[PDB]
């Protein structure tokens, strides 16, 4: 699993065209204030331990930043060892579930299987942009 | 070299704190309209052929998108096989030079060695977000 953590002042997204034949999540949009935006690429090796490591790390980083909202943003482009779309969606659902057991704030999972527009205003402080890798 | 191509409606950045002891580029800011924002991670293996492959690809993609502005945005987070900061800066300078020989529009190289704030509005069409890898 490869993640990119972006500490935003604001964030918003809108699904546009379906990127998959039948996206498993409905279309939609959302916007937010201050949040940790976690761009999330699910990789072949990812299973339940990977999900829980990533959940624990996201919660600790958010703790460090004093963030109270986390956006799990599906992202196909951080890795060249991608899981298949059904496995990725399953892992991302698991990740959202896992994160709720470790982090007390708002967790939002953006829909899976769509092309997106987004806007972000990413903060400039030293810990505002970081990447992570998890395996098992 | 690992790149992320984001076809933006708008883009802007501002240097904040120096991320290196002595950033080799002066502080600053810029904003843009429609552009291809190329987040660029220079890797250990990168040399002159890598630079030219990446220049040629950026020019072709921009051609496909009918983009007339390209932003070369230094980005430490796309890879876990990073070049050292001096080599990376040299490669990025070379990349800007190379791109000017293949692409007729505006090329802007964002400064190197800084923490940045940025804002992007990334388009939602199918080719608006893509990643690339170059080696030699
Ligand atoms: N291994 C993987 N990990 C995470 N997400 C994955 C995935 N495989 C497919 N997706 C999702 O399907 C869309 C098209 O690739 C992806 N959509 C996107 O990456 C948009 N942000 C592009 O505009 C994403 O929803
Ligand atoms: N191998 C590498 N490839 C590309 N850029 C590199 C690099 N090594 C260092 N940098 C630059 O130094 C800043 C701190 O890591 C980097 N700054 C950034 O990545 C900001 N966007 C963070 O806010 C970048 O300017
Ligand atoms: Mg809509
Ligand atoms: Mg300034």
Author numbering:
A (entry chain A), B (entry chain A): 1 to 136
Give the text the authors published on this PDB structure:
Both share a striking structural and mechanistic similarity highlighting a common ancestry. Here we show, with the help of structural, biochemical and biophysical studies from three distant organisms, that the substrate specificity in this domain is determined by a differential remodelling of the catalytic centre at the RNA–protein interface rather than just the presence or absence of catalytic water as previously proposed. While demonstrating that the tRNA provides the catalytic group, we show that the side chains within the recognition site are dispensable for the proofreading function, suggesting a primordial mode of protein- or peptide scaffold-based enzymatic activity evolved alongside that of RNA.
On the other hand, the Lys to Met mutant, although showed partial activity against L-Ser-(Ec)tRNAThr in our earlier work, in subsequent studies with not only PabNTD K121M but also the corresponding K116M and K122M mutants of ApNTD and MjNTD with multiple batches of protein showed a severely compromised activity, suggesting a crucial role of this residue in enzyme function. However, a direct role of Lys in catalysis is still highly unlikely considering that this position is naturally occupied by a Met in the structural homologue DTD. We solved the crystal structure of K121M mutant of PabNTD and K116M mutant of ApNTD with L-Ser3AA and L-Thr3AA to investigate the structural basis of the observed loss of activity. This provides a clear structural basis for the loss of function in this mutant, despite its high binding affinity for the substrate. Therefore, we show that Lys plays a crucial role in positioning the water molecule for catalysis rather than acting as a nucleophile.
